[PDB]
Amino acid sequence: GTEKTVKVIKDGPALGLTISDNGAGYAFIKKIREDSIMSRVANVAVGDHIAKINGTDLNGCRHFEVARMLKEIPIGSEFTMICVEPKKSFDEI
Known part of the structure; x- marks a missing residue:
């Protein structure tokens, strides 16, 4: 999958992410709340791992381990997150 570097300022206590996991592999982004820090990140999307x-x-x-790591980041800190896009359908035209 396509790998992406996300660099974000955690300016408040909530990033706007809902994350889950299916019991194996990586945790993934299930929802990104409208009008949130993460909705404003240009290169992160629902479905990314x-x-x-x-x-x-x-x-x-x-997901609870990944969530803990994001939650613990102090407010005001920058952080980096590597996200991987799943391989989904597309059209080239």
């Missing part, structure tokens, strides 16, 4: 946060490998991690 969260591969790393701040260089930490999150392969195999449950």
